[PDB]
Design a protein around this ligand. Structure first.
Ligand SMILES: [K+]
Ligand SMILES: [K+]
Ligand SMILES: [K+]
Ligand SMILES: [Mg+2]
Ligand SMILES: [Mg+2]
Ligand SMILES: [Mg+2]
Ligand SMILES: [Mg+2]
Ligand SMILES: [Mg+2]
Ligand SMILES: [Mg+2]
Ligand SMILES: [Mg+2]
Ligand SMILES: [Mg+2]
Ligand SMILES: [Mg+2]
Ligand SMILES: [Mg+2]
Ligand SMILES: [Mg+2]
Ligand SMILES: [Mg+2]
Ligand SMILES: [Mg+2]
Ligand SMILES: [Mg+2]
Ligand SMILES: [Mg+2]
Ligand SMILES: [Mg+2]
Ligand SMILES: [Mg+2]
Ligand SMILES: [Mg+2]
Ligand SMILES: [Mg+2]
Ligand SMILES: [Mg+2]
Ligand SMILES: [Mg+2]
Ligand SMILES: [Mg+2]
Ligand SMILES: [Mg+2]
Ligand SMILES: [Mg+2]
Ligand SMILES: [Mg+2]
Ligand SMILES: [Mg+2]
Ligand SMILES: [Mg+2]
Ligand SMILES: [Mg+2]
Ligand SMILES: [Mg+2]
Ligand SMILES: [Mg+2]
Ligand SMILES: [Mg+2]
Ligand SMILES: [Mg+2]
Ligand SMILES: [Mg+2]
Ligand SMILES: [Mg+2]
Ligand SMILES: [Mg+2]
Ligand SMILES: [Mg+2]
Ligand SMILES: [Mg+2]
Ligand SMILES: [Mg+2]
Ligand SMILES: [Mg+2]
Ligand SMILES: [Mg+2]
Ligand SMILES: [Mg+2]
Lengths: 386, 129, 63
RNA sequence: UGUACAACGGGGUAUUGUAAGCAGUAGAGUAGCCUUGGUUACGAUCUGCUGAGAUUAAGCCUUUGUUGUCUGAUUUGU
RNA sequence: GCAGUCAAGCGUUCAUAGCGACAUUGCUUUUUGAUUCUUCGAUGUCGGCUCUUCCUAUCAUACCGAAGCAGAAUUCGGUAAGCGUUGGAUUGUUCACCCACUAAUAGGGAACGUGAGCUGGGUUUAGACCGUCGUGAGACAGGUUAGUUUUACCCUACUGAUGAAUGUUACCGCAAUAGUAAUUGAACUUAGUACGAGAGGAACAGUUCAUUCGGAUAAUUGGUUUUUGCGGCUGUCUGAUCAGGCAUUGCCGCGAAGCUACCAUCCGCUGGAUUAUGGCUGAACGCCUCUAAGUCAGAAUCCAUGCUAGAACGCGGUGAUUUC
RNA sequence: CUCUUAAGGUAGCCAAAUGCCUCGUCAUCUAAUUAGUGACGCGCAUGAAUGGAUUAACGAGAUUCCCACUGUCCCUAUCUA
RNA sequence: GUGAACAGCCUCUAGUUGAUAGAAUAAUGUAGAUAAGGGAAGUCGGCAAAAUAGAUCCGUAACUUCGGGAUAAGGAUUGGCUCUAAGGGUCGCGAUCAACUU
RNA sequence: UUCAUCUAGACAGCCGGACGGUGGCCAUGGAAGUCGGAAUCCGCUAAGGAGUGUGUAACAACUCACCGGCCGAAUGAACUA
């Protein structure tokens, strides 16, 4: 008989299976549609989630109860040092989909990216790309032949880039290598851009700008095996329930005489690939710019790094992307920031945000001070120093 | 007309009557504008219009359903300027379905969101947040 | 943006931090954190709580 | 055999809330003593040194310091 | 229970806007019967809770046709199951009834779904009371009170998790197939406008929010405390002090980290093809006709975009491939 | 006045752990009450040691309401062994 | 020792240190806890839990078989320290001795 | 299948007319072939109905039946399965 009281199902069947992602770096499964009139540019970027903080800004939203008023907003900081271009892949269209025709690599690959090709780097003889780099012996005839093939074919061009983890506080030391689609016309010009940028760095400001809507693609934080109550949000069973209450009472009707795929079951929670869209960039800050965390309203000469450092991450010393709100993945995780797949004109996008103040109080507690100078000014002289 | 406020007054909550209508408290029996979800209690927040009964107060006010407006919450809610705030108690005022107050004065402070939402409450208010 | 003052401890409250309590008499109290909020709710005297600016002013600390 | 890693140590951050010890013409008083205008003993507590002391990565940040570590086993061929 | 046909009449006049007698044709198996085919070496007997899915005879939402459609409200009907369809008082209850919110509080199925999922209030052993009946033992589809709810470690299914074999190993990818998701309201404005004598009183576009749901996330706020981190306190023990033990985490305040909450914050895409329907041209049928050929637009529909998984017997590109 | 087999339900009590109809009717309690309580009583089928009515105190008995209280719930979260 | 106490908690004498262990810290459990705002809306039903709690002082209703109800209900206080007062024995007002309770 | 129309021009379309007496009488508040009531009057007739309807307070006026012109051979109705 019927359910006797209607209620929406628990969870989204489109995010199935709730299994562990096959990689710690979530795949970009779609790049922006290519507009072959614009200049050649990366469609995405690689960064590392540093942490969260809060900003204050005046809201520019006519008709709102908070128009021209100050609002406090959570922001996520993504450490984004320049990525190194080390390769270029050509993709030909086939009746079976896109197929990589060939890949041309840079002549010199740094140990950062060479470590990606090894499970035991320290005891290896580090032979990776040693025979390939000889293809640049005298004139690079083989390299130019492969690039000519990419131009003659390969309706889609993607560059191979890798992060510079040595510039992050992470202990990993093994770089993240990814394909980023080159948008901007003239497949020939895409290949020329890739070849010229071989062994060269691309900074995050050449890809993203202030107020832009971007998408964050990352593997969520892992939580291991989870019961249905927190994995799917099902109702806790009553206290009187024998055999436990963090369960789904009826996992199926008599017929079909099978548990169905749509029934909440205990299993892995977290560590899933997610692609969350429409996160507005609030800052495109630069590592070389001391007073990274300053605004035109604050002027306090401070970097984005909170007092004591980003908890479990470290200090931001590179270029960084501050997006509004939160993004999937935990701190220290590699994230991919990609340009929006559509042209959003909604007055939520297209809003020009100007930060008034960025919180740099310690996130290791109820941080009361923005700067060590401010802590000294409030507390006066202490016994050890100050 | 008002941003989301943390719901602090589920059905069955008794708040103090802040007006001078002769009611001493309001017993929430319903919340206007509330949605539906299995097992979920309708819950009021500051500025909400509720259906209530007077449990203690004038007998001509008791034993009947009447509209009321929550003017103090006591459950912490976050304003858009980042301020988490709360009152010392939960309090509402008796009104008609149009938002006009039955009484003519408010005792205690009134939430700014409720004051913006209901002008008659604002007109009869004293301190606003 | 404006920095408020903790009504119990005197600490600077930056936007979003702590809580705001509206007493029945319409008096507004600002707390930078749950520690000062809890001491206030416990009715402790800031002049007796030794790390507060009120205690330090009363005991001539820092000047 | 290194912008290497680790164990400690240092610094930052953070939590608590002012350590032990010493001292005081502080202390409700009580008891003694005599140069009866002060002394001795006891005394919760108070005050100062002292936002001190303690703890702080175990899934915090950092490190020009100290000490140490860095070739064991198995398997894989178109 | 639901739906047709005819059309005497109702509907001021008018059978068919909406209804509809006398008749009559059906469908359904969410009623109750009828039967006794299966089960009596046992298929766990009410209801509820929980949860998934399906049906459409659609309550709401989308788009429409009709009206005894001026507006508003409403009624009849079409495509439509994409999406939602509630909080409570009484009762074991299904049912019922009322309060109230709501866009709406539609009807159903899945062994009258669901007891090795619960619960056990009822029913349905044994105790007991009553009333009626009985000479009595006892009876009552009458009332009342108390009354053990057992087992999964197997197989499959489901959820997640490894994994031999493809020369080895490594990295970057493709995408068959499978899944898929957003939802609904309000306020402002349009506008006191269209419409209307008046009373009343819209809608498209725009704006700001909210509901229900979903996916994350922890800057902030709140919760959590074996950080047994700091402090406080009792009782006792270590001769006193200092510093500690024990009190099954002794208790209290605070408490970082981590986890976490519509109790917190963020985010939730745009193209095509269609349905009903309204049309174009246009014969059939020298006229007419949205239809027959051809064709335009068009729904919360569908398929894509997008999002998740990646075939462990689908595929590609690329690095290095063992001196002894 | 009778007749069935003697009498013909008195005092009380009640939709009561006894009332089918029945969720009786009225009042009250609630926003709303098949619950509770107070009434009513041609009471299917109440009733006098098959004891009737009432009763202070008592009760791991059955039941309703209220104050306090709370994770029973809204709506779950976290910690220890 | 605390305490009214053969209660609970700690200790002396005596006895024991025996329960298969090691490593991790997923879900679901069993046992023990906490929780913003609301406060029984959950449920057959407040089941479970919470709240209360010792002692001193104040105050205590209906009803009643006059015995109770009664710890009704409802209030306040409680540590530590330094003091004050009162409460005894024996010997011949004095001398001396002595223990706790208020 | 049956009944009809039809080169002595069938149905459709287009075009032209569609009268005189007579705006007939009766009246309708106002009817003028037609809200309307009886007769569907005679003549000229190819045809023209006191009109077929519309329109207008009525009108003025249209419009159709009807008749002609064109057209060229098929057409209409009721039934059966
Ligand atoms: K049987
Ligand atoms: K926390
Ligand atoms: K101790
Ligand atoms: Mg349903
Ligand atoms: Mg969640
Ligand atoms: Mg049980
Ligand atoms: Mg923090
Ligand atoms: Mg429920
Ligand atoms: Mg906290
Ligand atoms: Mg037979
Ligand atoms: Mg058998
Ligand atoms: Mg069996
Ligand atoms: Mg079975
Ligand atoms: Mg249908
Ligand atoms: Mg069944
Ligand atoms: Mg079963
Ligand atoms: Mg069972
Ligand atoms: Mg059952
Ligand atoms: Mg039972
Ligand atoms: Mg029995
Ligand atoms: Mg008998
Ligand atoms: Mg604790
Ligand atoms: Mg011991
Ligand atoms: Mg201890
Ligand atoms: Mg046409
Ligand atoms: Mg066609
Ligand atoms: Mg595969
Ligand atoms: Mg009688
Ligand atoms: Mg009776
Ligand atoms: Mg009664
Ligand atoms: Mg009740
Ligand atoms: Mg007798
Ligand atoms: Mg009897
Ligand atoms: Mg007894
Ligand atoms: Mg004693
Ligand atoms: Mg609580
Ligand atoms: Mg509380
Ligand atoms: Mg309460
Ligand atoms: Mg209830
Ligand atoms: Mg209920
Ligand atoms: Mg009940
Ligand atoms: Mg209990
Ligand atoms: Mg008492
Ligand atoms: Mg009593």
């Amino acid at each position: 008989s019927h359910r006797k009281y209607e209620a929406p199902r628990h969870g989204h069947l489109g995010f199935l299976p709730r299994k562990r992602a096959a990689s710690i770096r979530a795949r970009v499964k779609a790049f922006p549609k290519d507009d072959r009139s614009k200049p050649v540019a990366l469609t995405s970027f690689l960064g590392y989630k540093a942490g969260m903080t809060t900003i204050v800004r005046d809201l520019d939203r006519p008709g709102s109860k908070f128009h021209k008023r100050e609002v406090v907003e959570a922001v996520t900081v993504v450490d984004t040092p320049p990525v190194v271009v080390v390769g270029v892949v050509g993709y030909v269209e086939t009746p079976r989909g896109l197929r990589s025709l060939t890949t041309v690599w840079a002549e010199h690959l740094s140990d950062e990216v060479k470590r990606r090709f090894y499970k035991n780097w320290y005891k290896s003889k580090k032979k990776a790309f040693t025979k390939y780099s000889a293809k640049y012996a005298q004139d690079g005839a083989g390299i130019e032949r492969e690039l000519a093939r990419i131009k003659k074919y390969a309706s889609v061009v993607r560059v191979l880039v890798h992060t510079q983890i040595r510039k992050t506080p992470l202990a990993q030391k093994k770089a993240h290598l990814a394909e980023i689609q080159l948008n901007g016309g003239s497949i020939s010009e895409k290949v020329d851009w890739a070849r010229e940028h071989f062994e060269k760095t691309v900074a995050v400001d050449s890809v993203f700008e202030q107020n832009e809507m971007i998408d964050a693609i990352a593997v969520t934080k892992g939580h291991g095996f989870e019961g249905v109550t927190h994995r799917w949000g099902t109702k806790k069973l009553p206290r009187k329930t024998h055999r436990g209450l963090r369960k789904v009472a009826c996992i199926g009707a008599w017929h079909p005489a099978h548990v169905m795929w749509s029934v909440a079951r205990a299993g892995q929670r977290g560590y899933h690939s997610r692609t969350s869209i429409n996160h507005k960039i609030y800052r495109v800050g630069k590592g070389d710019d001391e007073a990274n965390g300053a605004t035109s309203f604050d002027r306090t000469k401070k970097t984005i790094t909170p007092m004591g450092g980003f908890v479990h991450y470290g200090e931001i010393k590179n270029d960084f992307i501050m997006v509004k709100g939160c993004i999937p993945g935990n701190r220290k995780r590699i994230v991919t920031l990609r340009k929006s797949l559509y042209t959003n004109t909604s007055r939520k996008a297209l809003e020009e945000v100007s930060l008034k103040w960025i919180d740099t109080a310690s996130k290791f507690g109820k941080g009361r001070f923005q700067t060590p100078a401010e802590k000294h000014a409030f507390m006066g002289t202490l016994k050890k120093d100050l | 007309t008002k941003f989301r406020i943390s719901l602090g007054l589920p059905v069955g909550a008794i708040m103090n009557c802040a007006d001078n209508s002769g009611a001493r408290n309001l017993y929430i029996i319903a919340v206007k504008g509330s949605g539906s979800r299995l097992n979920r209690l309708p819950a009021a927040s500051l500025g909400d219009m509720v259906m209530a009964t007077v449990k203690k107060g004038k007998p001509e006010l008791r034993k009947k359903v009447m509209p009321a407006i929550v003017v103090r919450q006591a459950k912490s809610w976050r304003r858009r300027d980042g301020v988490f705030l709360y009152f010392e108690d939960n309090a509402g005022v008796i009104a008609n379905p149009k938002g006009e107050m039955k009484g003519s004065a408010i005792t205690g402070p009134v939430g700014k969101e409720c004051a913006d939402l209901w002008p008659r409450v604002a007109s009869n208010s004293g301190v606003v947040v | 943006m404006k920095v408020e003052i903790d009504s119990f401890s005197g600490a600077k409250i930056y936007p979003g931090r702590g809580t705001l309590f509206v007493r029945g008499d319409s008096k507004i109290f600002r707390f930078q954190n749950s520690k000062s909020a809890s001491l206030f709710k416990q009715r402790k005297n800031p002049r007796r709580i030794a790390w507060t600016v009120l205690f330090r002013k009363h005991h001539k600390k820092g000047i």
